Design a protein around this ligand. Sequence first.
Ligand SMILES: *[C@@H]1O[C@H](CO)[C@@H](O[C@@H]2O[C@H](CO)[C@@H](O[C@@H]3O[C@H](CO)[C@@H](O[C@@H]4O[C@H](CO)[C@@H](O[C@H]5O[C@H](CO)[C@@H](O[C@@H]6O[C@H](CO)[C@@H](O)[C@H](O)[C@@H]6O)[C@H](O)[C@@H]5O)[C@H](O)[C@@H]4O)[C@H](O)[C@@H]3O)[C@H](O)[C@H]2NC(C)=O)[C@H](O)[C@H]1NC(C)=O
Ligand SMILES: *[C@@H]1O[C@H](CO)[C@@H](O[C@@H]2O[C@H](CO)[C@@H](O[C@@H]3O[C@H](CO[C@@H]4O[C@H](CO)[C@@H](O)[C@H](O)[C@@H]4O)[C@@H](O[C@H]4O[C@H](CO)[C@@H](O)[C@H](O)[C@@H]4O)[C@H](O)[C@@H]3O)[C@H](O)[C@H]2NC(C)=O)[C@H](O)[C@H]1NC(C)=O
Ligand SMILES: *[C@@H]1O[C@H](CO)[C@@H](O[C@@H]2O[C@H](CO)[C@@H](O)[C@H](O)[C@H]2NC(C)=O)[C@H](O)[C@H]1NC(C)=O
Ligand SMILES: OC[C@H]1O[C@@H](OC[C@H]2O[C@H](O)[C@H](O)[C@@H](O)[C@@H]2O)[C@H](O)[C@@H](O)[C@H]1O
Ligand SMILES: [Fe+3]
Ligand SMILES: [Zn+2]
Ligand SMILES: [Zn+2]
Length: 341
Amino acid sequence: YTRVVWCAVGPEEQKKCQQWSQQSGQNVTCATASTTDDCIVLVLKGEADALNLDGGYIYTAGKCGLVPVLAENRKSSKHSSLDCVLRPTEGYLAVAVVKKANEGLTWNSLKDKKSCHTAVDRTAGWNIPMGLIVNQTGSCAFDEFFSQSCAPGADPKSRLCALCAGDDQGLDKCVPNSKEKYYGYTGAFRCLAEDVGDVAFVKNDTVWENTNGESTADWAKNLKREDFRLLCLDGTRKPVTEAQSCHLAVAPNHAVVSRSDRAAHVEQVLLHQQALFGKNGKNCPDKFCLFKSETKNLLFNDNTECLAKLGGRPTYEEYLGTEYVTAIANLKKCSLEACAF
Ligand SMILES: *[C@@H]1O[C@H](CO)[C@@H](O[C@@H]2O[C@H](CO)[C@@H](O[C@@H]3O[C@H](CO)[C@@H](O[C@@H]4O[C@H](CO)[C@@H](O[C@H]5O[C@H](CO)[C@@H](O[C@@H]6O[C@H](CO)[C@@H](O)[C@H](O)[C@@H]6O)[C@H](O)[C@@H]5O)[C@H](O)[C@@H]4O)[C@H](O)[C@@H]3O)[C@H](O)[C@H]2NC(C)=O)[C@H](O)[C@H]1NC(C)=O
Ligand SMILES: *[C@@H]1O[C@H](CO)[C@@H](O[C@@H]2O[C@H](CO)[C@@H](O[C@@H]3O[C@H](CO[C@@H]4O[C@H](CO)[C@@H](O)[C@H](O)[C@@H]4O)[C@@H](O[C@H]4O[C@H](CO)[C@@H](O)[C@H](O)[C@@H]4O)[C@H](O)[C@@H]3O)[C@H](O)[C@H]2NC(C)=O)[C@H](O)[C@H]1NC(C)=O
Ligand SMILES: *[C@@H]1O[C@H](CO)[C@@H](O[C@@H]2O[C@H](CO)[C@@H](O)[C@H](O)[C@H]2NC(C)=O)[C@H](O)[C@H]1NC(C)=O
Ligand SMILES: OC[C@H]1O[C@@H](OC[C@H]2O[C@H](O)[C@H](O)[C@@H](O)[C@@H]2O)[C@H](O)[C@@H](O)[C@H]1O
Ligand SMILES: [Fe+3]
Ligand SMILES: [Zn+2]
Ligand SMILES: [Zn+2]
């Protein structure tokens, strides 16, 4: 009744959800699916209530009638006066990142290089960079642009999965969940860091969070920001300090979605859960913190300060913005209006 079923993607998010479920005294319980699209179907069926989604998936869910409920809000130096929950969201910067040592690699020499993407259908990892590449090349053959990639969610037999590694045992190669070694923001940046790919399509924050000792994970321990460069659309290369002038787009924040008929109940529950387990929550450091998982961004991004109310009670189209929505529709015509399930 006043209980919410969260949808977890893969086994590691399932483990975090179970902990939260326990600590919440079953105010939250957990359903699990192997992929975000499967979680979306659980929500539509009414077998789960909610999950936090990247903007590309919000577009999928939105066509099927799911609505945005609360948004991830990270820290800002502006609007600092306003409480986090009431503060407007800023959006994150989609960037293309290379190694400084890979000299003369620019935006205009990316063809036939090796790429690292968060997952198919995601904003920074896929929709933004592939949308630009389609427009620029006047071709829908974006599966032939890079020599080899890791793009979780593509055909495992294809060149788009050639660089993906699967799990400890090499199983689940290219699955779009955190079992895949090079999945997600952190995974795609790891793919670059280890020189599997020439370029990673991630967000600005990912680079900062996994360099200069911010991570402590074995692969990230010795990474230095100066060893990296951003690719700008004008063919230039900049330091990672210059993302405000060298990004591919600004992305809408990840946001919790639910069925419209459940939105109000999901919202009320989540606001109480974050008071307990959020950033300064009564129980966070002590028992459980919702927004931590050791750099793994499980359920929510680890840099989330709070979940924020939306305001102007936006539809999914208003939330994503007309800019981004037309980007996706145009790219989507390479792969006609309805729910995809
Ligand atoms: C790319 O991604 C990066 C990773 O997310 C991100 O870097 C991150 O930036 C944030 C800031 O947005 C940093 O948070 C900050 O961390 C410091 C610890 O070093 C904290 O310590 C202080 O916190 C204070 C309270 O909020 C803060 O006071 C604030 O209020 C004063 C009012 O007097 C004001 O001062 C002014 O600042 C203006 C804007 O910068 C400046 O122009 C003006 O001259 C004036 O001095 C500010 O509004 C100020 O915020 C203190 O200043 C301290 O910061 C604090 O929690 C703070 O929020 C993250 O540490 C940092 N992450 C990492 C890992 O480095 C980049 O910003 C992203 N880049 C782009 C382009 O988006
Ligand atoms: C890949 O390429 C495709 C194809 O080019 C791109 O899709 C186009 O994206 C454009 C930008 O989103 C979009 O441009 C249109 O621009 C006009 C004018 O821009 C306006 O700016 C105003 C700010 O002062 C703002 O108030 C307006 O809302 C608008 O943003 C817009 O107006 C049109 O519609 C009006 C209908 O009432 C009409 O009167 C007017 O004459 C215009 O036709 C419009 O809303 C839009 O922004 C263009 O529509 C897109 N083209 C297609 C085919 O859909 C992709 O974005 C590219 N992909 C990537 C990743 O970049
Ligand atoms: C589980 O949910 C119930 C219902 O919201 C919570 O009980 C409320 O707790 C608040 C403040 O913590 C009290 O002031 C109210 O009187 C309670 N409301 C009702 C209707 O019982 C409970 O706190 C939740 N538990 C956890 C651990 O999240
Ligand atoms: O792209 C402009 C767009 O803005 C819409 O709402 C704001 C929206 O804009 C970005 O996507 C931002 O990063 C998001 O966090 C934010 O939700 C607007 O309603 C829409 O019509 C359009 O103009
Ligand atoms: Fe994203
Ligand atoms: Zn910009
Ligand atoms: Zn509206």
